[PDB]
Amino acid sequence: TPTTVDAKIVAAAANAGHWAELAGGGQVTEQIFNDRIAELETLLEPGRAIQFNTLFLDPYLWKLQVGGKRLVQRARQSGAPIDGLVVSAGIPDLEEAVDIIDELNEVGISHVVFKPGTVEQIRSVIRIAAEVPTKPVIVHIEGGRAGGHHSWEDLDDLLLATYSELRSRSNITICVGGGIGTPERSAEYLSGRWAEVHGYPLMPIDGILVGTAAMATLEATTSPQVKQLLVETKGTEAWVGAGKAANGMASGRSQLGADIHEIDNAASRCGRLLDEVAGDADAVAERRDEIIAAMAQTAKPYFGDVAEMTYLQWLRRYVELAIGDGNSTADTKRPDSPWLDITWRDRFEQMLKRAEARLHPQDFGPIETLFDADADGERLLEDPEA
């Protein structure tokens, strides 16, 4: 999501002659994402091809994917370079998967990508494989030792048990992933020598994915300070259960309750406080002083006392947080950067217009008819202080 959302890195990774999946978690519409593919295909040199990643998590995205898949359908009906589709966070049911495989863009899909997290999820994909035996299906088996979206399932035991049934389908391409930064450590899974430690006879793999080790890369949009942070983090051997920051890495749960692997060394303030607040919420009112100050430490600022705070302080706080002085929102608008906050600028307007709405005793003729003009209002907007 953060890493591959940039059209620059996914292009550069592909231009290096490598397979990559464009992130869909950073694209909220067909149009905004169609810009990325267009930026991709422009940065895509002749013939080179890439794939796309999608999430199963929420209904709104799955309804957006109906427009998204038809976008992928339209793109490839137009002959777009994107040669694959990646379903994430869950395995679609047979009728849902058949649809994806059999789409008008099917040949341009050329294979389908699934990411099973459990034994049952693996067995589900096997049934998707037997569905269309002539359709290539790349099964990426991840761990919970991996980054981001998490799981309680071991790296080995899952693949150790399900491998035999996975190889009874020729259309299944087995790909091991997670906790791999190097060719040396990942060489044994390729030779099949990795299963020998568990006594099982050799168990070779068809491919390997690297999520984490590519985050510190040059063409990645990761900030200079964030890269240095990922670097100095020391790594670990097989994941341990004991709750702590483990080798600069501690798990944490998202808003939905699912675990997320985040960096607890580079940033120790957000994760641990979150675990404090989460486990502490009954009595929050009692610890309010301790809790409200810690939000300010991680820069999740509450506002100074709500009543007593002057309307300036309100309106000056939004400008403070929304408008960066270094990036110069006015100068940020000119390149037409995707980082543009314009909803935040629109947010501040609705607050400004509310301020006029609150204090005006008269008919509201002079004030409202001015700031609402395009040419006039937009000029007023690029200069927040004025």
């Binding site: 550069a12 030792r145 980054g147 930064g181 997320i260 985040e262």
Partner: protein, 145 residues
């Protein structure tokens, strides 16, 4: 309010990076040392050292490795036609017509099999393939005359 949309601050932000949720994995972090190392370098580093390990023991300076530095191939012109499912026209990608030419053809003909230069694959759909000017592969389809 806390956890929502926390993934974007790691990229292009001047703020203190110790306040941000940034996502590694636990064990993969050990393999992360070099900073601002180009994607092309990391991915090749994987492939190049995987090749050497495979080369040294089993292959021992294989014909495949030697053929590469000397430019020799697998899947020549005749195979490439029957291999790649995608047929490019300009910047657009199309399915290989041979897939629908090979089997569905009533009369299909492969001329001079073992000889590569003279190799020709023709069909009753009136579509024929041959090589011209070295690397250029010539597919010739016809309607009536």
């Amino acid at each position: 309010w806390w956890r929502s949309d926390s993934l974007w601050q790691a990229h292009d932000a001047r703020y203190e990076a110790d306040q941000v949720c940034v996502i590694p994995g636990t064990a993969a972090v050990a393999g992360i040392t070099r900073v601002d190392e180009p994607v092309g370098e990391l991915l090749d580093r994987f492939e190049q050292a995987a090749v050497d390990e495979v080369l040294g023991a089993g292959a021992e300076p294989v014909e495949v490795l030697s053929r590469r530095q000397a430019r020799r191939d697998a899947s020549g012109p005749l195979a490439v036609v029957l291999d790649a499912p995608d047929v490019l026209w300009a910047g657009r990608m199309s399915v290989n017509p041979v897939h629908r030419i090979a089997a569905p053809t009533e009369w299909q003909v492969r001329e001079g099999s073992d000889n590569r230069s003279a190799s020709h694959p023709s069909t009753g759909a009136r579509l024929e393939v041959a090589d011209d000017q070295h690397v250029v592969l010539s597919v010739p389809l016809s309607g009536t005359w």
